[PDB]
Amino acid sequence: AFPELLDRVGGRGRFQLLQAVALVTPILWVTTQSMLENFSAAVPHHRCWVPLLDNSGRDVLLAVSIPPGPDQRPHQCLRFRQPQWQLIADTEPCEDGWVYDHSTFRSTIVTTWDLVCDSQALRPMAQSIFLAGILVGAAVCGHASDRFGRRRVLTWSYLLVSVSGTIAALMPTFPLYCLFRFLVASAVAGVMMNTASLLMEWTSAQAGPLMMTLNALGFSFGQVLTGSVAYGVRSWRMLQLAVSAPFFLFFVYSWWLPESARWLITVGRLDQSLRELQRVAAVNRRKAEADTLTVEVLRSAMRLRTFISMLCWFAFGFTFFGLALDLQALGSNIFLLQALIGIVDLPVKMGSLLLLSRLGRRLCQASSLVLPGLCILANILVPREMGILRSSLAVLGLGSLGAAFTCVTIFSSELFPTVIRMTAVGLGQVAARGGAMLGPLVRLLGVYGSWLPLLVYGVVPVLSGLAALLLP
């Protein structure tokens, strides 16, 4: 009977726009704190420290000091014991530390804590820890919004994000940085889930398309904001502080947003719900039917397809979050990538959905997975002679892959008895945030050929899309 009360008090109107913008704005920085593991932990070119060079023909000393490496570059993990002046066998690893290339990045975490050479596996583990934090935070926060309300949890998660992000930029050792990033990720997941729920509840029966489109648009613009901010600040200690500073002001101004009315009814807090409904009525300027709200009215108010959807969600999350955090090795000009993903995401998603919806829902679902799979797979075949083709295909593939997040949510998830769609979207998202755990760990397979990670990241979505055609 709550929709009757909502229609009595409003619907569309003015408040549902102000609240919408005030909740969409943090999504950009939420995206920023997730893809920030791309300009902070960036690996520049590194070499062994030499006593002859860098104080106690420069090319001649470079040749006589470091043995040549395989990839037409000086070796990054070995050094001559003595200057081999025979050059106009016995090699030994560094102890004096490495020297880095300070031309684009002033200081990275790899620069700070020397996560190179033997200690290489640690870098693709920070993102796995972050995704574990997101998964745990999303799992725990589910049974947290039924006892503590829904508006309070949002404010406390904003404060937690701000405090943990600020503190993490002041740690002197790696494990504490990983722990604070874990906390940041959990709080961010809580923020995202609560924002989605609060957007869903307060609006009318038209909640489906508009708000779920606005959330995706917020993520897409958050990508561009990440790119811009990264272009702005270059140091890594000054990047985390600059990114996490706004969240305190967000916690400050989110202290006045009306709490969800539907939840207050189910718990018996009738007086607060009545006051909240009256204030939204005053804001919406529909102070005509609010008289009928006289408390007594509210007192009286008080298996194949699941497998396929789970597989699609797992493939999307796995490949996307295992391939969207390594744009450094995918091309060049890292600031133009990660800032062209959303610009190639929104138009492609509107156009592809518009052109494909008419042909069929299953056709659109399958076509949104095999196409990016081949798009990614064709990247390894083309040579490095042309870089524009080396970069365009991957960008297009990632943009099309991002369209699956919308295609398998709004047009899909109806593959069920059709009672209500919120019983399956959460279960599908369980895999997504569980599969991205098993993501960047694939990049640990850089040894034993470098084409294997890309081959896997291309094969998995292709197989998922091909199997999606086997619904009957």
Ligand X SMILES: O=c1[nH]c(=O)c2[nH]c(=O)[nH]c2[nH]1
Q: What residue type is 344 in one-letter code?
A: V
For ligand X, which is the closer residue by CB, 31 or 145?
A: 31
Consecutive H or E run containing 6: helix 2-9
Output the smallest distance, CB 215 to ligand X, in A: 7
Q: Tell me, what DSSP letter sits at residue 110? A: H
Angle at 197 between CA 398 and CA 158, to 5 degrees: 80
Q: What residue type is 33 in one-letter code?
A: Q
Cβ distance 268 to 298 under 8 Å?
no
Helices (H) and strands (E) counted in the chain, each on its own, are 18, 4
Q: What residue type is 227 in one-letter code?
A: G
Output the smallest distance, CB 373 to ligand X, in A: 16
For ligand X, which is the closer residue by CB, 227 or 402?
A: 402
Output the smallest distance, CB 415 to ligand X, in A: 20
Cβ distance 199 to 215 under 8 Å?
yes
| CB burial string 224-233: b at 16+ within 10 A, e below | bbbbebbeeb
Output the smallest distance, CB 444 to ligand X, in A: 19
What does the binding site for ligand X look like in residue numbers (CB under 6 A)?
Answer: 192, 316-317, 320-321, 405, 429, 432-433, 436
Can you tell me whether residue 360 is helix, strand or coil? coil
For ligand X, which is the closer residue by CB, 74 or 402?
A: 402
Q: Which neighbouring-strand residues pair with 98?
A: 48
Output the smallest distance, CB 321 to ligand X, in A: 5
For ligand X, which is the closer residue by CB, 30 or 468?
A: 30
Output the smallest distance, CB 461 to ligand X, in A: 12
Written as six digits, the tokens of 381 are 């075949």
Output the smallest distance, CB 129 to ligand X, in A: 15
Cβ distance 401 to 320 under 8 Å?
yes
For ligand X, which is the closer residue by CB, 177 or 316?
A: 316
Output the smallest distance, CB 134 to ligand X, in A: 7
79-80 and 91-92 beta bridge pairing: antiparallel
CA atoms within 13 A on the CB side of 377: 14
Cβ distance 325 to 377 under 8 Å?
no
For ligand X, which is the closer residue by CB, 74 or 372?
A: 372
